[PDB]
């Protein structure tokens, strides 16, 4: 089900903008117990972002969750 992906997205978004920024992403990661540096966090975005905007959109979010 893709609901799992939507659920994860809902947990990531901190307002309902539909565009997960590095700040919101880091917030969730830190809450999970993952303490990474500025570079490490940005790297995650740089790999997920295919457009090259500086954030992860719904489409890219779905692809990253299905990555292998």
């Amino acid at each position: 089900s893709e609901e799992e992906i939507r659920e994860a997205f809902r947990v990531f978004d901190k307002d309902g903008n539909g565009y997960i920024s590095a700040a919101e992403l880091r917030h969730v990661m830190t809450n999970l117990g993952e303490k990474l540096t500025d570079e490490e966090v940005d790297e995650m975005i740089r790999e997920a972002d295919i457009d090259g905007d500086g954030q992860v959109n719904y489409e890219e979010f779905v692809q990253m969750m299905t990555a292998k």
Partner: peptide, 12 residues
Amino acid sequence: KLAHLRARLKEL
């Protein structure tokens, strides 16, 4: 990893 993230996220 991304897969591990979805796993732990579901735990909490």
